[PDB]
PDB file of C-alpha atoms and ligand atoms in Angstrom:
ATOM      1  CA  UNK Y   1       8.916  -9.551 -85.316  1.00  0.00           C
ATOM      2  CA  UNK Y   2       6.858  -6.302 -84.600  1.00  0.00           C
ATOM      3  CA  UNK Y   3       4.574  -4.870 -87.023  1.00  0.00           C
ATOM      4  CA  UNK Y   4       4.710  -1.248 -87.871  1.00  0.00           C
ATOM      5  CA  UNK Y   5       1.013  -0.910 -87.625  1.00  0.00           C
ATOM      6  CA  UNK Y   6       1.308  -2.049 -83.845  1.00  0.00           C
ATOM      7  CA  UNK Y   7       3.683   0.808 -82.678  1.00  0.00           C
ATOM      8  CA  UNK Y   8       1.961   3.725 -80.627  1.00  0.00           C
ATOM      9  CA  UNK Y   9       1.103   6.741 -81.737  1.00  0.00           C
ATOM     10  CA  UNK Y  10       3.707   8.614 -80.372  1.00  0.00           C
ATOM     11  CA  UNK Y  11       6.964   6.534 -82.001  1.00  0.00           C
ATOM     12  CA  UNK Y  12       4.709   6.705 -86.171  1.00  0.00           C
ATOM     13  CA  UNK Y  13       5.084  10.304 -85.730  1.00  0.00           C
ATOM     14  CA  UNK Y  14       8.248  10.291 -85.027  1.00  0.00           C
ATOM     15  CA  UNK Y  15       9.153   7.621 -88.060  1.00  0.00           C
ATOM     16  CA  UNK Y  16       6.842  10.060 -90.062  1.00  0.00           C
ATOM     17  CA  UNK Y  17       8.951  13.503 -88.918  1.00  0.00           C
ATOM     18  CA  UNK Y  18      11.563  12.055 -90.511  1.00  0.00           C
ATOM     19  CA  UNK Y  19       9.801  10.969 -93.495  1.00  0.00           C
ATOM     20  CA  UNK Y  20       9.057  14.124 -94.296  1.00  0.00           C
ATOM     21  CA  UNK Y  21       9.845  16.343 -97.826  1.00  0.00           C
ATOM     22  CA  UNK Y  22      10.394  13.811-100.592  1.00  0.00           C
ATOM     23  CA  UNK Y  23      11.847  10.743 -97.645  1.00  0.00           C
ATOM     24  CA  UNK Y  24       8.672   8.931 -98.283  1.00  0.00           C
ATOM     25  CA  UNK Y  25       8.421   8.841-101.798  1.00  0.00           C
ATOM     26  CA  UNK Y  26      11.872   7.592-101.955  1.00  0.00           C
ATOM     27  CA  UNK Y  27      11.093   4.728 -99.249  1.00  0.00           C
ATOM     28  CA  UNK Y  28       7.834   4.312-100.743  1.00  0.00           C
ATOM     29  CA  UNK Y  29       9.501   3.351-103.959  1.00  0.00           C
ATOM     30  CA  UNK Y  30      11.915   0.692-102.140  1.00  0.00           C
ATOM     31  CA  UNK Y  31       8.432  -0.862-100.941  1.00  0.00           C
ATOM     32  CA  UNK Y  32       7.179  -1.711-104.413  1.00  0.00           C
ATOM     33  CA  UNK Y  33       5.254   1.310-105.178  1.00  0.00           C
ATOM     34  CA  UNK Y  34       5.362   2.682-109.030  1.00  0.00           C
ATOM     35  CA  UNK Y  35       5.321   6.049-109.160  1.00  0.00           C
ATOM     36  CA  UNK Y  36       1.240   6.847-110.134  1.00  0.00           C
ATOM     37  CA  UNK Y  37       1.378   4.873-106.847  1.00  0.00           C
ATOM     38  CA  UNK Y  38       3.117   6.880-104.645  1.00  0.00           C
ATOM     39  CA  UNK Y  39       1.162  10.130-106.974  1.00  0.00           C
ATOM     40  CA  UNK Y  40      -2.054   8.911-105.512  1.00  0.00           C
ATOM     41  CA  UNK Y  41      -1.410   9.564-101.679  1.00  0.00           C
ATOM     42  CA  UNK Y  42      -0.310  13.643-102.288  1.00  0.00           C
ATOM     43  CA  UNK Y  43      -4.336  13.583-101.960  1.00  0.00           C
ATOM     44  CA  UNK Y  44      -3.777  12.595 -98.597  1.00  0.00           C
ATOM     45  CA  UNK Y  45      -3.638  15.195 -96.000  1.00  0.00           C
ATOM     46  CA  UNK Y  46      -0.386  13.020 -94.651  1.00  0.00           C
ATOM     47  CA  UNK Y  47       0.925  11.702 -97.050  1.00  0.00           C
ATOM     48  CA  UNK Y  48       3.621   9.347 -95.458  1.00  0.00           C
ATOM     49  CA  UNK Y  49       0.739   8.234 -92.932  1.00  0.00           C
ATOM     50  CA  UNK Y  50      -1.803   7.781 -95.814  1.00  0.00           C
ATOM     51  CA  UNK Y  51       1.099   5.498 -97.403  1.00  0.00           C
ATOM     52  CA  UNK Y  52       2.513   3.546 -93.977  1.00  0.00           C
ATOM     53  CA  UNK Y  53      -1.348   2.656 -93.049  1.00  0.00           C
ATOM     54  CA  UNK Y  54      -1.954   1.240 -96.528  1.00  0.00           C
ATOM     55  CA  UNK Y  55       1.834  -0.410 -96.076  1.00  0.00           C
ATOM     56  CA  UNK Y  56       0.844  -2.225 -92.894  1.00  0.00           C
ATOM     57  CA  UNK Y  57      -1.467  -3.476 -93.490  1.00  0.00           C
ATOM     58  CA  UNK Y  58      -0.143  -6.225 -94.659  1.00  0.00           C
ATOM     59  CA  UNK Y  59       1.535  -9.225 -92.281  1.00  0.00           C
ATOM     60  CA  UNK Y  60       5.313  -8.833 -93.840  1.00  0.00           C
ATOM     61  CA  UNK Y  61       5.213  -4.526 -92.724  1.00  0.00           C
ATOM     62  CA  UNK Y  62       7.437  -5.055 -89.680  1.00  0.00           C
ATOM     63  CA  UNK Y  63       9.184  -1.807 -87.996  1.00  0.00           C
ATOM     64  CA  UNK Y  64      12.250  -3.729 -89.240  1.00  0.00           C
ATOM     65  CA  UNK Y  65      11.041  -4.418 -92.762  1.00  0.00           C
ATOM     66  CA  UNK Y  66      10.918  -0.126 -93.208  1.00  0.00           C
ATOM     67  CA  UNK Y  67      14.273  -0.261 -91.492  1.00  0.00           C
ATOM     68  CA  UNK Y  68      15.918  -2.629 -93.884  1.00  0.00           C
ATOM     69  CA  UNK Y  69      14.287  -0.819 -96.597  1.00  0.00           C
ATOM     70  CA  UNK Y  70      15.601   2.351 -94.977  1.00  0.00           C
ATOM     71  CA  UNK Y  71      18.898   1.152 -95.223  1.00  0.00           C
ATOM     72  CA  UNK Y  72      18.234   0.154 -98.822  1.00  0.00           C
ATOM     73  CA  UNK Y  73      17.477   3.994 -99.913  1.00  0.00           C
ATOM     74  CA  UNK Y  74      21.488   4.720 -98.133  1.00  0.00           C
ATOM     75  CA  UNK Y  75      19.006   6.746 -95.105  1.00  0.00           C
ATOM     76  CA  UNK Y  76      20.974   4.688 -92.357  1.00  0.00           C
ATOM     77  CA  UNK Y  77      21.076   8.376 -90.408  1.00  0.00           C
ATOM     78  CA  UNK Y  78      16.810   7.726 -89.731  1.00  0.00           C
ATOM     79  CA  UNK Y  79      17.112   4.080 -89.140  1.00  0.00           C
ATOM     80  CA  UNK Y  80      20.826   5.327 -86.498  1.00  0.00           C
ATOM     81  CA  UNK Y  81      18.142   8.842 -84.900  1.00  0.00           C
ATOM     82  CA  UNK Y  82      15.439   6.109 -84.578  1.00  0.00           C
ATOM     83  CA  UNK Y  83      17.316   3.479 -82.359  1.00  0.00           C
ATOM     84  CA  UNK Y  84      18.672   6.631 -80.151  1.00  0.00           C
TER      85      UNK Y  84
HETATM   86  O1  MNB W   1       4.595  16.869 -90.116  1.00  0.00           O
HETATM   87  C1  MNB W   1       4.511  16.376 -90.085  1.00  0.00           C
HETATM   88  O2  MNB W   1       5.423  15.833 -91.859  1.00  0.00           O
HETATM   89  C2  MNB W   1       3.181  15.298 -89.845  1.00  0.00           C
HETATM   90  C3  MNB W   1       2.088  15.428 -91.369  1.00  0.00           C
HETATM   91  C4  MNB W   1       0.800  14.976 -91.348  1.00  0.00           C
HETATM   92  S1  MNB W   1       0.123  15.519 -92.033  1.00  0.00           S
HETATM   93  C5  MNB W   1       0.755  14.538 -90.014  1.00  0.00           C
HETATM   94  C6  MNB W   1       1.552  13.714 -89.030  1.00  0.00           C
HETATM   95  C7  MNB W   1       2.835  14.289 -89.406  1.00  0.00           C
HETATM   96  N1  MNB W   1       4.169  14.153 -87.696  1.00  0.00           N
HETATM   97  O3  MNB W   1       4.131  13.367 -87.178  1.00  0.00           O
HETATM   98  O4  MNB W   1       5.786  14.098 -88.317  1.00  0.00           O
HETATM   99  O1  MNB W   2      10.633  -0.187 -80.927  1.00  0.00           O
HETATM  100  C1  MNB W   2      11.741   1.044 -80.866  1.00  0.00           C
HETATM  101  O2  MNB W   2      12.019   2.065 -79.863  1.00  0.00           O
HETATM  102  C2  MNB W   2      12.234   1.292 -82.253  1.00  0.00           C
HETATM  103  C3  MNB W   2      13.446   0.526 -81.882  1.00  0.00           C
HETATM  104  C4  MNB W   2      14.793   0.799 -83.674  1.00  0.00           C
HETATM  105  S1  MNB W   2      15.961   0.198 -83.357  1.00  0.00           S
HETATM  106  C5  MNB W   2      13.842   1.695 -84.627  1.00  0.00           C
HETATM  107  C6  MNB W   2      12.563   2.620 -84.751  1.00  0.00           C
HETATM  108  C7  MNB W   2      12.008   2.011 -83.275  1.00  0.00           C
HETATM  109  N1  MNB W   2      10.670   2.762 -83.145  1.00  0.00           N
HETATM  110  O3  MNB W   2      10.350   3.407 -84.833  1.00  0.00           O
HETATM  111  O4  MNB W   2       9.735   2.345 -82.857  1.00  0.00           O
END
């Protein structure tokens, strides 16, 4: 129901924190981004934030779609942690 982009900055920075390291790359793969497209975000100061801002532009970029993507890369631990 809720668009990712509509979440308060405070929630989005929790999401971003948990997607640190290479997790954002794994997630981006699941969201349908090609390797070189992903590599293009490494030029940003905040690659995770840049990715999700781009992804979040679509109308099907809901929190639940994001959460679904995370379960699929076997990172339900992040879903559990955010739902806590
Ligand atoms: O700690 C990070 O990995 C992080 C980095 C940048 S550039 C922006 C937001 C962040 N948050 O919020 O996690
Ligand atoms: O709306 C919420 O508080 C929220 C709930 C769940 S289950 C997961 C992530 C969330 N984030 O990130 O906002």
